């Protein structure tokens, strides 16, 4: 149970990027700046 | 308003027309210098 509960809570971690919501950086940043920051949350969520 | 070149910045903190969906939105109007438009920006303390 508490291995899943770690895994769900790390959705909301920023991993050093701007938001942990991809609705935020896609609908606010420039498309070359969105695609660098959305590249950062992918690897961060993968290590979870 | 945005599709115009009579203006100088349109800087928002385009994605700027779909990010614009919130509550009471203001129109804070004031007279700046060109060295003061520079600091109409978040922070700039």
PDB file of C-alpha atoms in Angstrom, chain A residues 24 26-31, chain B residues 12-13 15-16 18-19 22:
ATOM      1  CA  UNK A  24       0.664  24.995 -16.791  1.00  0.00           C
ATOM      2  CA  UNK A  26       2.183  23.969 -22.130  1.00  0.00           C
ATOM      3  CA  UNK A  27      -0.492  26.672 -21.945  1.00  0.00           C
ATOM      4  CA  UNK A  28       1.908  29.360 -20.758  1.00  0.00           C
ATOM      5  CA  UNK A  29       5.420  28.861 -22.096  1.00  0.00           C
ATOM      6  CA  UNK A  30       6.710  29.263 -25.607  1.00  0.00           C
ATOM      7  CA  UNK A  31       6.695  25.950 -27.542  1.00  0.00           C
TER       8      UNK A  31
ATOM      9  CA  UNK B  12       2.320  38.025 -20.207  1.00  0.00           C
ATOM     10  CA  UNK B  13       3.460  36.179 -17.070  1.00  0.00           C
ATOM     11  CA  UNK B  15      -0.309  30.865 -25.170  1.00  0.00           C
ATOM     12  CA  UNK B  16      -1.087  34.337 -23.777  1.00  0.00           C
ATOM     13  CA  UNK B  18      -5.518  30.817 -23.817  1.00  0.00           C
ATOM     14  CA  UNK B  19      -3.775  31.330 -20.465  1.00  0.00           C
ATOM     15  CA  UNK B  22      -9.480  33.674 -14.720  1.00  0.00           C
TER      16      UNK B  22
END
